[PDB]
Structures are given as structure tokens and as C-alpha cells.
Symmetry: D2
Subunit: 286 residues, 4 copies
Amino acid sequence: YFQSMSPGKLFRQAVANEHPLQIVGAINAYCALLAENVGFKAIYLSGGGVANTLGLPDLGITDLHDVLEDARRITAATHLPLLVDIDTGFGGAFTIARAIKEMERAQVAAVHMEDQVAQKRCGHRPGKELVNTNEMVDRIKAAVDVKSNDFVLIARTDAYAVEGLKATIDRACTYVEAGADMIFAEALENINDYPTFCKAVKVPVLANMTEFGKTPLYTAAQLADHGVKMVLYPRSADRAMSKAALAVYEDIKKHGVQTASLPFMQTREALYEVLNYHAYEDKLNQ
Amino acid sequence: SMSPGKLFRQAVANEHPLQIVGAINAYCALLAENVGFKAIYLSGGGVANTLGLPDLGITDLHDVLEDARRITAATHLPLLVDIDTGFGGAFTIARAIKEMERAQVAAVHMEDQVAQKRCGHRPGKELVNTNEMVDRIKAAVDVKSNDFVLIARTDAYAVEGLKATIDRACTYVEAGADMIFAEALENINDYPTFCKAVKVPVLANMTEFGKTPLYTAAQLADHGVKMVLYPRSADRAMSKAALAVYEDIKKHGVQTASLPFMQTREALYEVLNYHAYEDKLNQLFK
Amino acid sequence: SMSPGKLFRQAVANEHPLQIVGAINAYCALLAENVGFKAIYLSGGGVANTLGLPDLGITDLHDVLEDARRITAATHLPLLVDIDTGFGGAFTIARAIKEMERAQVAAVHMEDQVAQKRCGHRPGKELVNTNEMVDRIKAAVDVKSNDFVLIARTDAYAVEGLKATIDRACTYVEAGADMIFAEALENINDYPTFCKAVKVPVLANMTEFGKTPLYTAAQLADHGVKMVLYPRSADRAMSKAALAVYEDIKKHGVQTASLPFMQTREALYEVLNYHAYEDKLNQLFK
Amino acid sequence: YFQSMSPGKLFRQAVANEHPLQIVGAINAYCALLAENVGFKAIYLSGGGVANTLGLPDLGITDLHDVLEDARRITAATHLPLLVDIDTGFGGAFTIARAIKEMERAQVAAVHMEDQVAQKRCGHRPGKELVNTNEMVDRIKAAVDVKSNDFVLIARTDAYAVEGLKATIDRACTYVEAGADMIFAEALENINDYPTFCKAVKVPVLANMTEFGKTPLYTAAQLADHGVKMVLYPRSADRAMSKAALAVYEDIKKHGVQTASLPFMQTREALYEVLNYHAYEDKLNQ
Ligand SMILES: C[C@](O)(C(=O)O)[C@H](CC(=O)O)C(=O)O
Ligand SMILES: C[C@](O)(C(=O)O)[C@H](CC(=O)O)C(=O)O
Ligand SMILES: C[C@](O)(C(=O)O)[C@H](CC(=O)O)C(=O)O
Ligand SMILES: C[C@](O)(C(=O)O)[C@H](CC(=O)O)C(=O)O
Ligand SMILES: [Cl-]
Ligand SMILES: [Cl-]
Ligand SMILES: [Cl-]
Ligand SMILES: [Cl-]
Ligand SMILES: [Cl-]
Ligand SMILES: [Cl-]
Ligand SMILES: [Cl-]
Ligand SMILES: [Cl-]
Ligand SMILES: [Cl-]
Ligand SMILES: [Cl-]
Ligand SMILES: [Cl-]
Ligand SMILES: [Cl-]
Ligand SMILES: [Cl-]
Ligand SMILES: [Cl-]
Ligand SMILES: [Cl-]
Ligand SMILES: [Cl-]
Ligand SMILES: [Mg+2]
Ligand SMILES: [Mg+2]
Ligand SMILES: [Mg+2]
Ligand SMILES: [Mg+2]
């Protein structure tokens, strides 16, 4: 409306307005513009996406700055509310506080922080270990301490795969008590566990619709009918982009020319429309 | 021991001709490397457009430098970087060259448009006079290392005709440019006379949706061309793929129909060389 | 609820006159805040010089933006930022304003020099015509929020005389500048006629080693000035102190003679508010 | 000589040439230019300095990017070899590897990494705890794995204050066996412990000459005569700069003008000489 809303308020309103809110991963500002064009009401900056786009595996190598810089580029280009993955907060209480404040300064609408172990030994192997409830509570309190009211903290639990449904609900509920605004859980293997989950935690729940993992793909409607308020598509666009890029590279290498690839390329014209190119080049000219 | 610039010069000498493919980010550069390209490119229009900006000279040294650094962190494959008109006067050009060298960049191209430049394939470009471009080149050559490659790009063809273009190119070589970028030549039969006149290696720009027909690398080489550039080819396909995934999710409430068009986790793991990470930990911490 | 720009406008209205002190970094801004200044300044010459560059328009939006962000992260004290001539054309100026707003900056000043600008106190400045500066201002006003302060700076005095300067300033106000920066006026008696003619608040630049005698804030206010700027004062003393410590260590093999000239750990801890950190941990994790 | 030496080689050579090498802290590029002018042969980027200059306490809040960005600005301005504080490496093996590679890419000559605990619990209080020898060995091996031969890794031990001389020597020796190039220890309370220390570890030893701690100030000559190859002055310049800045701020606030401060300010002329201003403004002019 005519209030000029804060990013967090826009996010909360998008969640309330949609049934459910679909949030799509965008690796850069241009992809966010594409999503906006299609009509999505919220967008997402994946941590794994930030790492992988740098040519790094998703092993917690990236820091606040890697993510912050990708987030800033996106929010500069669109007012569509952005949810940002900040992993485990990048360090202790003061680093978490810095992350929240910097994300808010970057006009980000929401972040999710998770309950994985962060600060393992130097030569410590990759794995799927959870911190205790109390430790995650501390992380949340560090975040809640400095956030504005409108800004959305989503607490993400990875407990489901490891601990089962009951333990997950207990954590999620404790996380809400600590001040989390919403809850991020993996796609439950059984759609009919959602009503119990959503009713227990009270706050809006996000379901993560990842491909090529251990989790099934339900429709947004199905998920909403079972109590879910947000559905996330974290890497979907990016996996298709990579296949397309690879195919173009192979085409050029094999054939000495990109002719066969032409039908698979967005046109200059469509690119110009997404950028509003003509309302620059033409619009203002000597 | 072998500098980026040296690797570039050697790639140019070894290949007939050297295909240089655009990569917008480090992951795309890894894809190109996997396919077996010998040099990669950071497009200025790509830098701008990926930020959601038109290619109108809004971006500065920092926008481009940051994208270049992310790519060279991930690969030793020699990178050619678009630095437009050098981002300002002599001192800015000098800063650009030194920063590009510090970022392990192999080559740059700088062009002879007036400051507020456009795509070389667009109508209504203004050129600086030969003397002014000479000054730009001199500023660059004054601070570059010997191995580092300065490519002088001329946009003169559309505006001044083939003869004037060749004269500029030749003057640019005399001023110390290492190679020539012959932008938006409309006919394969422009190349032999161009390439014979300038002597130094010449790049032909095989961009789509422009003023050039798409000739093969062999055809271009047979006409005296040493480098063929594919500046945005991968990027255009990526955008269409992203858009298609976004439409799928919006229309169908789920990304199932998109799955066949996505790179697999396995292929992603291979391109990131994920297993070398586990390997390294076993190597060092055992 | 109260925007940076609003805090700035209010500081200007409340003080007689508002003293604005240069701070090169966040720690200097904290020192100024401690002393009780109501507004702070990020000098363009300071941005350049601190990088080891001359103040010749080599720096870009990113150099300045990064220094501005570091300061505003540390303090809510309203910050005025030097954006030179806007770093390029209309679209660059628009980007600068939006980025400055995103960085929580309160005010900017933009001047009427030609692109490759110098210190306003140096001989041999070239000015753009009034019309061109008007265009610059319009580009800025078009995208700014209402609260955000655009200060139009004129360097015309040395080149064109007092009368021409006032005419420009007045045209700049008509174009939408909020306040006026009257650079390098040589005599206190230039101010009353200047300030009365332009109406909007006027800043006088009390820089050292320039073309201006150093008048008191009271004297300047009595002549109709609303803001007095001390752009590099702290920075010049810091450099002499650093140099003196370096000479001490080099000459004497030890820094003993320098100890009396060093801030104590205690004072440093107070300015950082170090104890609030321990306090916060006790508050939250008990 | 006429070889064009790598930064690390320049550092090694500076250490070998001097008796001992004095390395002075510089918070920014301009301070590094001042040190170079005075005649120092190596410079230092303090971690505490990076944090404090951001207005942050030295509590491990800063990351690789905060330090990297300050390091890049310095090395852009001078070829004087820079030693950079990278704390405990900013995370596990892969983060350490990234830190080394990025520091090398930034033309840094040397880093020091320490044996403090890093990855404490979220709401975990500030303190002076050491990791076990084995853990630091792992950190060193992570670093040595990716560094170039010439690049200098200095292993820093904080064991002295906590564990005594004997335990410190044992750690230092183990650190050298793991591949550290040099050793950083606090100022030993007894100058005559240095010969034993230096003879046991073999590699060059740095003594840290901090003010206002628990460590005494010996002269460079005294330290060198006892076996020490490097003496560090980490914050000295910066503490004097802060006192000078504060004094200028108080002057302007108290007196309404900076006249009393003038004798304590570096002149425009001296600033111009350090920057080589005249060989820009004059040197190249239309
Ligand atoms: C959402 C996620 O955490 C991410 O890093 O984007 C991933 C999603 C994915 O790529 O499978 C996750 O850890 O599930
Ligand atoms: C090569 C180019 O300079 C670019 O910035 O990618 C462009 C390509 C394009 O617009 O398709 C150009 O100006 O030719
Ligand atoms: C205020 C100023 O614009 C600056 O960039 O600090 C300078 C100050 C100076 O050079 O002393 C100016 O141009 O007046
Ligand atoms: C060298 C040091 O580690 C630093 O962070 O610069 C400090 C020095 C100091 O400021 O006392 C330290 O921890 O001793
Ligand atoms: Cl991965
Ligand atoms: Cl916007
Ligand atoms: Cl920001
Ligand atoms: Cl609840
Ligand atoms: Cl465009
Ligand atoms: Cl590499
Ligand atoms: Cl040549
Ligand atoms: Cl690896
Ligand atoms: Cl200067
Ligand atoms: Cl604050
Ligand atoms: Cl007005
Ligand atoms: Cl605090
Ligand atoms: Cl501290
Ligand atoms: Cl240099
Ligand atoms: Cl770099
Ligand atoms: Cl030994
Ligand atoms: Mg993630
Ligand atoms: Mg371009
Ligand atoms: Mg200035
Ligand atoms: Mg430190």
C-alpha cells in the first residue's frame, strides 16, 4: 500500500498473501529480474549457490562477505523481498550480530540460520552434525538481539533426517520460543506429517523443494493444503543454467560455431525488455 | 614461472584459431575448462547485464575487477577482460591495467568509443579520434608488463567504413597494442585485408543477434583471424533455461517437468572436483 | 523511523552553525562522536589520498561507497559524503545516489567541475556550464528520497567571480539542490550576499593550507552560514603523528619517546565501547 | 637485483639484509607510504588494527575479506613487502587454504597465523586459550599445502604468557617441523631468553614490540644482538594518530576553529610530496 514498506514487512506480507508463497533461488541480479518478470513474489540467495558459483564446494568456506556481496547486487536491482542463506551465522554471537545488521543494511528481507555444527577442527571432515538445542537457541538470541522488528529470522533445522519428526518439532518449538519468526524444515517424506508439524510450531513453515536429494517433490498447492506457508526452490534455475551453458560450450567446441545453440538462447530483444534497455539508450540521448 | 599473459600469447600461437568463450562467473569458467577451451572471456555487457544494468558504461573498474577476480581464483585458464574505454582518463586506465594484472588477468581489450559507450553491434556509436585512442593505449602500455596482452578494439567499421578502420587499427598497433579486436565486421571478406594490414593477431567477435553472420572458426581462420570470441553465447542459453524453470514452477506448482533439463548432482560434483576435497583432507590429516 | 537525511536536516536546523568534521575511517568517526559532533564527513580527497592516490578523480563510486559503508556501520551520526562530479553521466549519478542511500548515508555533495576534477583550492579548475550541472542535479533529484540531502557544490568563485557563482548556486537550488556548498570563498564578506541570495542552507569549507583564511564557526554563522566543514583537519594531524612515530622508531630503535603521544589502551577501549561487549554476552548467555 | 623478485622473496631478503628487520604497522596505504619515506624495509597489517579501524573490538569478528581488502589497498600503493595478520586462519583447512591463496594473489609477502582457539561456542566469552600443538600443526599443514615456495608463513605462538618458555619452544619447534618459515613470539620478559629461543627454533624469530601490555621495550639492536631477526611495531603509529585526531576534534569543538591544531598538521606540501602529486596534476595536462 501507500506506506513504503520495509523489506521484512514486504516478506511477511508476501507470506500472508500467497497460498503458499513460492520462493525461487536466483544466483544473481539478472536471474532475480527473470523471476520477477514471471511473477514470483519473493526470491532466494542460496548459500550453496553462492559457493558453487565461485567454483567452491558448499563446505562452509564462504564468509559473510561472499554472501553479502551477492545479496547487495540482487537487492540493488529489485525490491522483490529476498531471503538470504547465512548458514550457521559465520561465527559467534558478535559475527551473527554483524551478519544480521549487514543483511538489514543491504535491504535484505529475511535470513535463515541453521543448527548444523560450524566451527569444527581444522582438518575436520565434511558431515551432517547438529548442535544441541541450547547452542542454536544462543545463536538465535544473538540474532534477535539486534534485528529490527520487521526483519525476518527463519530458524532452519536439519534435525529431521538425523533425529526424526518428534525431535525436530521439539527443536523447532524451542527455536520459536527463542524468537525465531519462521521455521525452515526439509521436505518431510510424508505430506501428512506437515499438519502436525505446522500446528505445533505455530509460526509460518517453509518446505524446501530441492531436486536430486532424498526428499520428494509435492506441488505448492498440496503443501499449502497441509499447512505450509512457504515453498523454496533453492537451486532449480541454477541447475538448468549450468546444463545449458555446458551444452553451448560443447556445441562451440564440437562444431566450430554456435548455430545449433541459437534456438536455446534468450534473444537480445527479450534481454533488452527485462533490463528496460530502451528506456535508457533511447530515453536519454544527446 | 609462466605468466597469465604468456599463457594467453601461447594459446593464440598454438590454436588455429583460438576460440575464447565468455563466462559470466567462476562456475561457467570451470565448465568451459572441462570442455577444453584454452582461453576464457569476461564480457563487459555481461558484467553490467548480470547486475541488472544496461551496457551503457555505468559499471566501473570495481564492478569488472570483482567478477574477474572470482574467475581467476577458480582457474589458471587465461582470461581476457573487457575494460570498455578504460573507465576514465590516463590515470584510471593505468589503475585498470595494474589492477587487472594484480587479479592474474591475462589480457584486456579497450575500445575507441566515447566514454558513454554502447554495445559495438548497436547503431549510433560515437568514436574518439585516432589521437585520443592513441593516448588511451599509451597510458595502458606505459604501466603494463611485457607478457600482459593489450588488445585494442575498434568500433569504427559501422561508422567510418573498412578503410578508416584498418588505418585506426594500424595506428593502434604502432602505439603499442599487442593484438586487434575488429568489432562488427559484416562480411568474412573484410578479414583478409584487415588482418594482412595490421599484422598482429586479430580477434573476430562471433556474437549472436548482432550485425555479424555466424561464421565457423575454420572459415575465420582461413581469412587470417587468430582469435574468435563467443562473448555471451553461454549466458544467453542460461537465461532462457532459468526463465523456463521459473515459468515451470509458476505454472505447475512444482519443477518436475524441469528435472530433465537440470545438470545432475554428479556432474556438478565433478566440475567442482568435490572429491579432491575429501582426498586432500585424507592426504593431510591422517 | 527518523532517516539519515532527516537527522542531517535536523542537525543543520538545531546548530548555529552545524560543524561537520572529516573522518577517514570508522574509528575516527567514533572519536568525533565521543567529542560530541552532530555530523561527520567523508572527504573525496581523503578517500583518494588514503589509498595513496592524488585527488584527480581517479577513484570511483566503489572506492567512496566502501569507505562510507564502513563508517555508517559504526555510527548513526549523519554522514555527508563527497561524490565529486557524480562519477560519470546521469545513470552513474543515479546509481551513486541510490547506493549512498542504501549505505545509510545522510547527505552528498556533487560539484560543477569537469570530470577530471581537482581540489577546489587548487589553481586551474575547469567548470561545466550551468546547464550541464543542472542536468547532473536533475539526475540525482529524480531518484533521491525526500529526506536525503543533495548539496550542490560550486567551484566557480576562483574562476568566474562572486556574482557568477551566486547565479550558478541559485540555478542549482532551482534545479532541486537542498543545500549549497560555497567552495573557496576568500573573504568572510562574500558570505552574507551569497547566503541571502541562495536562501537554502550554505556550507563554508574551513580547510587548511588553502585559499581560505580560518574563520571561527561563530563568525561564519554571523555572516549567514549554516554549516562549517573541517574536511581533512583530523587526517592531517594523524599523518604527522604517524610520521613522527615512524621516525622515532627508525632513529632510536624503539618507540619509547613516542609513548606520551599515544592514546592509552583504556581510552581506546572506551571509544570502542569494549565493555558493552562483555556486558552483552553476560546479558544474553547467563 | 635485476630479477624482479616475488613479494615473499623481497621479505626474505629484507630479513637477511637487516640487523634486525624493523616491521612497522600501517593501517592504510597512506601510512605505508609514510613508513616507506622514512626508510623502513617491511610493513605490517595488524588484525587488531583492521578490526579497531572498523570500530570493532579485536574479538575475531572480522573475516578474510575485511583483512584482504585492507591488504590489497596497501600492496596497490607500495612494493615494500607486507606482513599480514590472518589470526587463526578464519576457519578450517579449506578456509586457511583460501586465505593463503588470496593473500598471495593480493601481492602480500608474508602472513602470520596463531595457535589461539578460534571456533568457540556462540555465546562464548573472550579469553586467551591455546589449541593443542597438533591442531596448530594441522593449521600450518593446511597453509603450507598451497603456498608458493617464496611466500612466507610465520607461525605465531601465544604460549609464552600461558605455558612458559619451555612449552613455547617445544611448540615453536614443532611448528617449524610442520613447515612454518619463521616464528612470531611475544616480547620475552628477559632479553637473555632470546639466544636459547632463537638457537632452538633455527628459523628467523620475530619479537613483538607492543606498547601498554605486559611486555618490556628493548631496542632493535639489543634484540638483534640476542639472536632476533625481526622486530614488529604493530600499533605504534595508529595509537599516536588516534590521539592526534581526538585532539583536533576537541580543538575544533572547544574553540570553534582549528588554529591551535595547525602546528600539529602535516602540510599540503608534504602530503603532495608523499603522493607524488605534482607528477600527476602538472605532469600530464591538456
Ligand atoms: C537450500 C540449501 O541449504 C542451499 O545451500 O541452498 C541446500 C539446497 C540444495 O541445493 O539441495 C540444502 O542444504 O538443502
Ligand atoms: C563483446 C562485447 O563487447 C561484450 O561486452 O560482451 C559485446 C557483445 C554483445 O553485445 O553481444 C559487443 O559490444 O560486441
Ligand atoms: C573538501 C574537499 O572537497 C575534500 O575532498 O576533502 C577538499 C578539501 C581540501 O582539498 O583541503 C576541497 O576540494 O576543498
Ligand atoms: C600484533 C597483534 O596481535 C595485532 O592484532 O596487531 C597485537 C598487538 C597489540 O596491539 O598489542 C597482539 O595481540 O599482541
Ligand atoms: Cl556442493
Ligand atoms: Cl530497485
Ligand atoms: Cl549496503
Ligand atoms: Cl510455539
Ligand atoms: Cl544491454
Ligand atoms: Cl586455481
Ligand atoms: Cl607491438
Ligand atoms: Cl582441493
Ligand atoms: Cl591531492
Ligand atoms: Cl550503529
Ligand atoms: Cl529545493
Ligand atoms: Cl555491543
Ligand atoms: Cl581491542
Ligand atoms: Cl606500486
Ligand atoms: Cl587481487
Ligand atoms: Cl628446528
Ligand atoms: Mg546453504
Ligand atoms: Mg563490452
Ligand atoms: Mg573532494
Ligand atoms: Mg591480531
